[PDB]
Amino acid sequence: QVQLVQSGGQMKKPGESMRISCRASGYEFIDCTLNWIRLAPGKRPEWMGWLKPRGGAVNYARPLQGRVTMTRDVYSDTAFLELRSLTVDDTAVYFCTRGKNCDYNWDFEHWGRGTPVIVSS
């Protein structure tokens, strides 16, 4: 058994930066991978990224290159997502996820509560 905590959804305007956090408890953070996902209804879900906390590694998605950043903090045991210059296209919900085991990173067993983000004007 394991669970993931989130700070909820936050709403904002077009064209600025913002942040969102997630954390994990049990099945220690330092060994196994994390994966962000975006859900826009009426649009295809997009693999946002994956961060290996063991060494600060990251491989962002090419369509979002540059204006999205990730960071870790081992002692606090958290996961920060940062993005810049949001548009209405990014109207979606966000999640933080985990895999079954520490060798595969696609068939996601444990998901967060979900956090909507809407911008209209």
Binding site: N59, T71, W106
Partner: protein, 451 residues
């Protein structure tokens, strides 16, 4: 049918795999004076003075590099030996008090990174204190633009994680090689054949009693001092479509790389207790220059085009494009690199600006409060070394990642350099040498009669 064919034979050439321990072996000549612990310790055993091998006729076996346990075995063992090296001879540090610095002004000019800094340590008498020039080097100070650092005063970076341990001045650090060999009842098998994709049957197979020596030098995203490949270039990777796993690349031909810590330096002792001795940079002499490295651009471009003409083979009509570092902490992005006790951090942007289808120079920064391995505890503190120091190596491989996102036919494909997982510095050499156990009590129906 006479006695319906029952008997038993001894010896019985059969074997099966088994997760089990491995063993030490090193050339035990020079290290008899390093009484304190070090990798190829005076303990263990002298290496066999006569290695043996034999080629086995018609043997068919499926080597599989990513599944084998022994890499994890050594990944635990080296860390444990590291701890047992920095468990004794170590002076727990009551550092992190109020300190104040300013621009060094060694010459009339301001130095690049050092800052002449005061420090009120404890005197030998527990009652009183005294001031001396002490440790500064920039990344290990929590800063502020005011007349002091942090918020006021300042503190060393380590004192909200764990107590950093002093490194033993007497203990050397070099990548002295180590062999491995198995106890009785176990043996090691070797795949001599080339063009091996890390899996599937290997035909040209030879049995070696004890593995060849490796140099377990720790580093990231630039495999160095590793044995060159058999021929041409080879990719050894656990799948490619699964972009999560890391992709290795290994070269037959070497490339010279050299780095220099040009400044002369001298360490000055500072006393911090009854018999506990601190060390740090005392003074600097001569021409001031940043640490850097030199590389021949022509050969680097040749090798990048070589790699390019390899991995194009794994795609029908796609095109490649290198790129600079992914991001995040300095540990993974820059080129981690170890040299005689001093440590180097080198920005690798200039080495990956190329594209597919005379003397490049690298900017680098020394670093003196290391938090490598797990990054969780056991931070160590090396002492600076007297005078200048230079060192060279043969680049052997690179650690790449494939990124992801949406793709279409005719689009470009992007690769980036990464690392971090120290295990992928170890799977480079030890893809050979499966571990195997012999079971000598098989049977077969055969006619016989005792009496």
């Amino acid at each position: 049918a006479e006695n319906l064919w029952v008997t038993v034979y001894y010896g019985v050439p059969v074997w099966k795999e088994a997760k089990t321990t491995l063993f030490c072996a090193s050339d035990a000549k020079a290290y008899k004076k390093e009484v304190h612990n070090v990798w190829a310790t005076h303990a263990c055993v002298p290496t066999d003075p006569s290695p043996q091998e034999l080629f086995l006729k018609n043997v068919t076996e499926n080597f599989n590099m990513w599944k084998n346990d022994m890499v994890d075995q050594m990944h635990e063992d080296i860390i444990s030996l590291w701890d047992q090296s920095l468990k004794p001879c170590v002076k727990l540090t009551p550092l992190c008090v109020t300190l104040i610095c300013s621009n060094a002004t060694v010459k009339n000019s301001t130095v690049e990174e050092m800052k002449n800094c005061s420090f009120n340590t404890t005197t030998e008498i527990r009652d009183k204190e005294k001031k001396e020039y002490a440790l500064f080097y920039r990344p290990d100070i929590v800063p502020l633009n005011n007349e002091t650092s942090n918020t006021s005063e300042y503190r060393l970076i380590n004192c909200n994680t764990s107590a950093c341990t002093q490194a033993c001045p007497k203990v050397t650090f070099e990548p002295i090689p180590i062999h491995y060999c198995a106890p009785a009842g176990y043996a090691i098998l070797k795949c001599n054949d080339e063009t091996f994709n890390g899996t599937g049957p290997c035909s040209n197979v030879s049995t070696v009693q004890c593995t060849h020596g490796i140099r377990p030098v720790v580093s990231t995203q630039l495999l160095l001092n590793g044995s060159l490949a058999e021929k041409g270039i080879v990719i050894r990777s656990e799948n490619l479509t699964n972009n999560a796993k890391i992709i290795i690349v290994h070269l037959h031909t070497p490339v010279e790389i050299v780095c220099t810590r040009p400044n002369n330096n001298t360490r000055k002792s500072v006393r911090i207790g009854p018999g506990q001795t601190f060390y740090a940079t005392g003074d600097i002499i001569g021409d001031i220059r940043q640490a850097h490295c030199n590389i021949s651009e022509s050969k680097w471009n040749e090798t990048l085009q070589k790699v390019g003409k390899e991995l194009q083979k794994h795609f029908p009509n796609k095109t490649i494009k290198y790129a600079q570092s992914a991001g995040g902490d300095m540990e993974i992005t820059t080129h981690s690199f170890n040299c005689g006790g001093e440590f180097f951090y080198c920005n690798t942007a200039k080495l990956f600006n190329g594209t597919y289808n005379p003397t490049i120079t690298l900017q680098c920064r020394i670093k003196q409060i290391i938090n490598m391995w797990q990054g969780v505890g056991r931070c160590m503190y090396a002492p600076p070394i007297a005078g200048n120091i230079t060192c060279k190596s043969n680049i052997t491989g690179l650690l790449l990642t494939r990124d992801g996102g949406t793709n279409s036919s005719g689009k470009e494909e992007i690769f980036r350099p990464a690392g971090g997982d120290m295990r992928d510095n170890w799977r480079s050499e030890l893809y050979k040498y499966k571990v195997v156990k012999i079971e000598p009590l098989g049977v077969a129906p055969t006619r016989c009669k005792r009496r």
